Structures are given as structure tokens and as C-alpha cells.
Design a protein around this nucleic acid. Structure first.
Ligand code: MG
Ligand code: MG
Ligand code: MG
Ligand code: MG
Ligand code: MG
Ligand code: MG
Ligand code: MG
Ligand code: MG
Ligand code: MG
Ligand code: MG
Ligand code: MG
Ligand code: MG
Ligand code: MG
Ligand code: MG
Ligand code: MG
Ligand code: MG
Ligand code: MG
Ligand code: MG
Ligand code: MG
Ligand code: ZN
Lengths: 25, 63, 127, 97, 214
RNA sequence: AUUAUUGCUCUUCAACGAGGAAUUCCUAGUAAGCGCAAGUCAUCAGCUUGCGUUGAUUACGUCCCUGCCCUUUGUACACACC
RNA sequence: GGUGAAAUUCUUGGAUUUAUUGAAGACUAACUACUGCGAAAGCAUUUGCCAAGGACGUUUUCAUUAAUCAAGAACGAAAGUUAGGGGAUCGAAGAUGAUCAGAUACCGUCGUAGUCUUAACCAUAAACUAUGCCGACUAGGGAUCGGGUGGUGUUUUUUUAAUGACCCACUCGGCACCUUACGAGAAAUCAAAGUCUUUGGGUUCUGGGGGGAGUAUGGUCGCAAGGCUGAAACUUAAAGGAAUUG
């Protein structure tokens, strides 16, 4: 896939991982 | 009806997309010294005689 | 010699406008654009159509009594194409060939100091 | 690899010029890269010259042709206006014709 | 089943004092009726005629003129000066590549008080024998010329209304005066007054308006 | 020899009044009209392969349509756009 | 009206067109160029004010005061965020008309945020010449920008000048192009990417097969979006560059 869509791909992914981890803070 | 007679001076070449049309310069026999280029229909060689149904008009390129 | 008025042909794409008015402009006469004389809706701007419209336009011109006219030719202009439409050339011819009179014509196409971003965005109209 | 020393077109010692909109597709494009053409053509045309002076007043008048600049987007400049395409060394020719 | 043509009144336009001919053209209004007659209704609209049609000479082919109507008497309506323009073809012509364009203007009043803004346009010219292909000015050059033209233009106006001003512009008096002061700076071909417009007119003053009529 | 191989005689006397959109072939002894020999064949040519007879009109051109070649150009294809 | 073609749409509410005149916000057309300037981002209407700069000129002044730079710091397109203003235009979103087998799109209509500005943030772009800075040396050519020098050059006439523009030759410093290549390179090409196995002028920075991955983790900056710093296990024989023929 296009580089810049792959960038936006993992950007989303990092936010959700950031999200989920906060539950356990 | 003002009939006008003109003799073919030269064969310029084929116009028209299909190409069945020829560009030709002519000289009128009545009152010579002026030449107009006309678009023909049939086959044409030099020294033919074209009857121009209208004396002053001309054309150049066809599609 | 004659009686003078203004022609003012607006020739765009997809239609063509020809309407004569009094030299002051406040009082006009006989519009009949090109979309009036045929409906294919794709043919509205055609040179053939503008001719037929220039026919009916020159008609009422004399039937009123303007015997002569000055033309101001016009395109869409503004932020638009700025180039004269197809049916403005036929129109001028067909209103000259009507036996009417012509003199001193110019271009009124609006041309900006440019501003006001053109439509279609940065990547252009793409098809 | 790099296929032009001019890169796209005509910019050295500047780094930013300002964009113009293409007269066809309305695409933005830098002015240095623009591919510009002056359009100079009569208000009248091939056929309408005779029928003009005929029914017109004045002694042959003026005949003041229209002038405007044209800017193309290189997609449109290739699709219609001056493009063709050129061989490796035909590209290097900047001669107008 | 109406046909306003069988209704509408007719008229004929009379030009101001000094150009060539005061006869201009015709117009259509309406019958003059009680409760919205033909008089106070329209009248004072404007007419744009080339002054070469007005003067008759073709060296004047450009330079359009605006004539605003003011008063009317007996199928005769007299007009006055609403402004002056240029033909698009001429300007689009005068502007050529490989050379510098210079414009300037000023807002200025007059005796009989008419406020107006006149413009000016001038292009640099090559000098005979010049080898280099462009001939551009020095931008210090440009500032000075703009100043001088501004200097010159401010003086010519405010002399005697637009009346003498009209008389001033027609045989290009200013155009040369520019050219005279200019030549000490840069060569400069063309140099016309291009546009002049009006914004604030004074009170009607029926008397002074008739000074141009006879 | 019935579902009738072919031939002959009498009788029966259909559609078809020049064929919509489309589309084939062709430049001189050619096109088209016309029959004949040979192949096949015990019998069966409305087919084909050749043959001669009668014998035109119209081009003698172009790139508009269609087909294919050629450069130029781009390519991440080389089992090569299936 | 709009398009390849159409349709949603607008039209007794006189649309589209014309005319006179007014309002609002944005932009700066043509002139505009292998032309200028700035550290870079970037900078094009006028005029006034405010401070700043390179090049040049220089028989002026100080006299090594410098080169380059981890840390640290100023500026930093577009979008985006906070709070006012502004909100003409074009227009992420959304809603529609169409096209399509489908069409969450391309084309058309409406149009929220936005686009502008003030006060604050944010620090990223193919932020590109994909090419560190200072110094030296090595080769030919005609244009052009700025400064300067040379003139019984041309043109401007007034009475010759003085000027101003222009011509020719030189010289500094510019933005670039042309031809060569001694030389260099894997080649494309390159007055540097040259003066490198005949390998050393000074100095800063980065890379060490491909994926995994700019991911995980810690720190830190941020209102947020996110920025900076930044691994491993595991997997894999290629991935990649330039050029040749198909
Ligand atoms: Mg919880
Ligand atoms: Mg396309
Ligand atoms: Mg490539
Ligand atoms: Mg560029
Ligand atoms: Mg940049
Ligand atoms: Mg038949
Ligand atoms: Mg047989
Ligand atoms: Mg068979
Ligand atoms: Mg290749
Ligand atoms: Mg401007
Ligand atoms: Mg808005
Ligand atoms: Mg949507
Ligand atoms: Mg849909
Ligand atoms: Mg969607
Ligand atoms: Mg970066
Ligand atoms: Mg770049
Ligand atoms: Mg050199
Ligand atoms: Mg000197
Ligand atoms: Mg070589
Ligand atoms: Zn385009």
C-alpha cells in the first residue's frame, strides 16, 4: 500500500494502543 | 443566369478527408489575367474547362 | 446617417446570447438567445443555432427601427475561460449578413486584477 | 533517474514562485513551470472579413484583434496544446517553432 | 397582444460643447403619464461613444467617453462629462513583453468642484542602436517618473472644472509634458492618460450646465 | 431405394411486386452474366478445383472509418498485459 | 444553468441578460523573464515612516579578533489547535444528481469547518540542487544582474556642454545556460560529483543486506494532533541502483 496511507495506518493503530493502555493506568 | 467559363491552369493536389476532391487554379477565358482556385469533384488534368456557376468565391481546405 | 444601438454578444460555451439595446443601455430590445432556436440541450451553443438566433434578432431590430448597431463581444470571463465561445463568430456574421450595419466593436470580457480562487480546486478538474 | 536538468521547469535561485490556475482543468501550477501561450486572433475570422467591411460603415475601419495569455497544466498541455513528445536530445531544444 | 413598441415614446441624444458634433443618437422611454411620467424617471443615464466617432478623425480611434444626461427640453436632452476610458484592444496591445510597465494616478478636485481620479500609463522603449534585447528601467527610475507624472497631473486638473480639463486632455497636452520631464530619466514610449473616472459631483446648478449649449 | 438416391410424364400453381438495421467482393478480357470438364462417384452437385464463352460502369485518389506495420516515448512486465 | 451526455437546481419571484449605483472580504492579473532579494521558510499595487543588508569603491580604521561546530537557541510553507474579529471566494466533512455489476469515488449541485486577521500555540513537507561549511588548485565560450574604471563611442540640442539612456573593451562579485573533458563515475552524468591504491588542507553530520519498524519500551516537549530520542526477538537470499535489448 501507499507509504503515506501506511503511515496513517499505524498512526491510528498507535492511538488505539495508547487508548487501551490507559484503561489500566 | 450569369454563366462563367474558366480553364484549369494547374493541379494543386487532393483535398478532402476521403480525398476524392482536388484543388485547382483556373483562368476565365472571358476577361483573363485573373486566377481563382476552385474545388473540383471528378477527375481532372491540366487545360480542362470548369463551369463556375458563381463567379467570385473560393475555398481552401476540407475535412 | 443611420440610427445607432448596441449589440453586445455574450458568447459562452453551452449557450450564446445576442441582444440589442439603446445606446444608453437602460432600454433594451429583442433578445432571443441561441437556446431558444433549438432544443437538444447539447446544441445550445452551436454556430448553426446562434445564426438562427441572429436571424430572429435582426428581424425585430429593423421591425422596431434600429438600422445600425455597435457590438461588444464577450466571453464568460471573471475567473472563467476568458476565450470567446464558438457561436459568437457565426452570430456577428449572421447579424452583419442580415443587411444591418456595423462599426467600432471591442471586447468587454471581464478580466480581473486576478483574485477569488478559481473553481475546481488544486488538483484540477480531472476526468 | 533525473530526466531533466531544468527539473520540471525554469527555477534556480528562488525556491518559491507563485502558482497559476490552468486555463483548461483549473489545476494549480507554479508560474515558472507554466507552459504559457499568447493568443492573438482577430475578432472576425477567415470567412467573416469580407461580409464585415461590406455591411459596415467607415473606410475599412481598424480590425483590432483580441489578446490574452494562456496557462496550461502539462497534463492539458500534453493532451492538446504544444507538447508532442521528444526524443532524448530533441528535449534539449528550447527553440520555439 | 401588447407590443410595448406601439406604446414607447422616442427621443434623441445631444452631446456637450467641445468635440465636433452634438448630434449623437436615439433612445426609447415610455409615454409621459401622470404618476410615473417619462421625465423624472430615466433621462440622466449615460452613453459611451468613441470620441473618434464623436470627433471623426481616426487617430483618436481609442479613448472611449462617458456622457451622462442631466437636463431635458422638448425632445432634446443635453449631456455632460461622466468620464473617459480606453479601448481594451489598445491596452492589450501597448503591453508587450521584454519591457517595463509604469502606472500612476491621483485623486484631485477642480474649480467648479468635481473630484476625479486620472490614471497614466507609460512603457520603456529601446533606444535606436541598442544591442541588449529587453531594456528595463532601474526601479529608482520608476519611482521618480511616477512622482513627476503625479507632480504634472495634479497641476493640470483643478484648473477650470472638467471644462478646460476636457479641452486639455483632447489634444494630448499632458502626454508630451510627461514625455518632456521624463526624457531626463528614461526613454519611455507610449505615455497616455488612459483612464479617468468621476466620483463626487457638485450640486446641479441649472445655470452653469447651460454654458456649453447653444 | 420405405424416411420417397436419380431420371421421365401428367397434374397440383405456394412465398416472392427489389427486400429494415446492417454487411460481402471487386480495377480490364477484370466485375458481373453464362455453361463445361475434372475431383468425389455403383447410383447422387444446388459443393469445390480449373476452363472457355459474352463482356461493362467507376477510381487511378486519400487516411475519414477499419486492419496492420513503423519510429518516438513510459515501464516495477522478461512465463513478457492471458 | 451545467456536462462526453444528462439530471438534481433557478425561473410572474420577470430568471439568464441589460443598465445606474452601493456594500463586504479576498487577491495583486497583463508587464513576468532560464531576471532580482533573503539564513531558509519565503518575497510582485501606491506612498510615508522605521530600522536592517550584500556587492562594489577605498594609499581609512583595529590587527588574528578566525574556520567549523555535540549541548543550547532564533526563524520555520500548508494543514491543524486556543480565544476574539472576519466569514466575498473557493471549499476536508456531510447531504444530494448522475455514472457503475457495485461507485462510500472520479463529473455536477448544496455547503459545515477552513481559507483572511489579531493574541497565543504546533515544528513538520519530495522543507529538493534528493548533493555540509571554510580554503587552494585545475578549461573554453557567448549572453545577463549589481558596482566600478577606461572614451577626440552613438543618440537626446539649447549654443556647445552638464546630465540621462545607449555602444564598445576591462574588472570585481551574482543567478544561470553553451561546448568540451585533461579528469571522475556502476552508469545516468558531473567545472565538481575533478586535483583517491601516485590513497592525508581544516572541520561538522549520517549510513553498514532486506524485512521486522520508525514498531515496542523509557525519557522529554505538546491543550490536542502529535514532535524529538528510539530497540529487540523472529524472519529472509535477496531487496536495491544505473544502463542494454525485448
Ligand atoms: Mg477505568
Ligand atoms: Mg485523464
Ligand atoms: Mg522514471
Ligand atoms: Mg520549481
Ligand atoms: Mg521549497
Ligand atoms: Mg436491387
Ligand atoms: Mg460429376
Ligand atoms: Mg463438399
Ligand atoms: Mg527502455
Ligand atoms: Mg499590479
Ligand atoms: Mg466561510
Ligand atoms: Mg460525500
Ligand atoms: Mg448514489
Ligand atoms: Mg464518504
Ligand atoms: Mg525530515
Ligand atoms: Mg525540487
Ligand atoms: Mg568558465
Ligand atoms: Mg563610464
Ligand atoms: Mg564521455
Ligand atoms: Zn490543465
Amino acid at each position: 500500500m501507499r507509504a503515506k496511507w501506511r503511515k496513517k495506518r499505524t498512526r491510528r493503530l498507535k492511538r488505539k494502543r495508547r487508548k487501551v493502555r490507559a484503561r489500566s493506568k | 443566369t450569369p454563366v462563367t467559363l474558366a480553364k484549369v491552369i494547374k493541379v494543386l493536389g487532393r483535398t478532402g478527408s476521403r480525398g476524392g476532391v482536388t484543388q485547382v487554379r483556373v483562368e476565365f477565358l472571358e476577361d483573363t489575367s485573373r486566377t481563382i482556385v476552385r474545388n473540383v469533384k471528378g477527375p481532372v488534368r491540366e487545360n480542362d474547362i470548369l463551369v463556375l456557376m458563381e463567379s467570385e468565391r473560393e475555398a481552401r481546405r476540407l475535412r | 446617417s443611420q440610427v445607432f444601438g448596441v449589440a453586445r454578444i455574450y458568447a459562452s460555451f453551452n449557450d450564446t446570447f445576442v441582444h440589442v439595446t439603446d445606446l444608453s443601455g437602460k432600454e433594451t430590445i429583442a433578445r432571443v438567445t441561441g437556446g431558444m432556436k433549438v432544443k437538444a440541450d447539447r446544441d445550445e451553443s452551436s454556430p448553426y443555432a446562434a445564426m438562427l438566433a441572429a436571424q430572429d434578432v435582426a428581424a425585430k431590430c429593423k421591425e422596431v427601427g434600429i438600422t445600425a448597431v455597435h457590438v461588444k463581444i464577450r466571453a464568460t470571463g471573471g475567473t472563467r475561460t476568458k476565450t470567446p465561445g464558438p457561436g459568437g463568430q457565426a452570430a456577428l456574421r449572421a447579424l452583419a449578413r442580415s443587411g444591418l450595419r456595423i462599426g467600432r466593436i471591442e471586447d468587454v470580457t471581464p478580466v480581473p486584477s486576478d483574485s477569488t480562487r478559481k473553481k475546481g480546486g488544486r488538483r484540477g478538474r480531472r476526468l | 533517474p533525473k530526466k531533466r536538468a531544468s527539473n520540471g521547469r525554469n527555477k534556480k535561485g528562488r525556491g518559491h514562485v507563485k502558482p497559476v490556475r490552468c486555463v483548461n482543468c483549473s489545476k494549480s501550477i507554479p508560474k515558472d513551470k507554466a507552459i504559457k501561450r499568447m493568443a492573438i486572433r482577430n475578432i472576425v475570422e477567415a470567412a467573416a472579413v469580407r461580409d464585415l467591411s461590406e455591411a459596415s460603415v467607415y473606410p475599412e475601419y481598424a480590425l483590432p484583434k483580441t489578446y490574452n495569455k494562456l496557462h496550461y497544466c502539462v497534463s492539458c498541455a500534453i493532451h492538446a496544446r504544444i507538447v508532442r513528445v521528444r526524443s532524448r536530445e530533441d528535449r534539449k531544444n528550447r527553440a520555439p517553432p | 397582444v401588447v407590443d410595448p413598441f406601439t406604446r414607447k415614446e422616442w427621443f434623441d441624444i445631444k452631446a456637450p460643447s467641445t468635440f465636433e458634433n452634438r448630434n449623437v443618437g436615439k433612445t426609447l422611454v415610455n409615454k409621459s403619464t401622470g404618476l410615473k411620467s417619462a421625465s423624472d424617471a430615466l433621462k440622466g443615464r449615460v452613453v459611451e461613444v468613441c470620441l473618434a466617432d464623436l470627433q471623426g478623425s481616426e487617430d483618436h480611434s481609442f479613448r472611449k467617453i462617458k456622457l451622462r444626461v442631466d437636463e431635458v427640453q422638448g425632445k432634446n436632452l443635453l449631456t455632460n462629462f461622466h468620464g473617459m476610458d480606453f479601448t481594451t484592444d489598445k491596452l492589450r496591445s501597448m503591453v508587450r513583453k521584454w519591457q517595463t510597465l509604469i502606472e500612476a494616478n491621483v485623486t484631485v478636485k477642480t474649480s467648479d468642484d468635481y473630484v476625479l481620479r486620472i490614471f497614466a500609463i507609460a512603457f520603456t522603449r529601446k533606444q535606436a542602436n541598442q544591442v541588449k534585447r529587453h531594456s528595463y528601467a532601474q526601479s529608482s527610475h520608476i519611482r521618480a517618473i511616477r512622482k513627476v507624472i503625479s507632480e504634472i497631473l495634479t497641476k493640470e486638473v483643478q484648473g477650470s472644472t472638467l471644462a478646460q480639463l476636457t479641452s486639455k486632455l483632447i489634444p494630448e497636452v499632458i502626454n508630451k509634458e510627461i514625455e518632456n520631464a521624463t526624457k531626463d530619466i528614461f526613454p519611455l514610449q507610449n505615455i497616455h492618460v488612459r483612464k479617468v473616472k468621476l466620483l463626487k459631483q457638485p450640486k446641479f446648478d441649472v445655470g452653469a450646465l447651460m454654458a456649453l449649449h447653444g
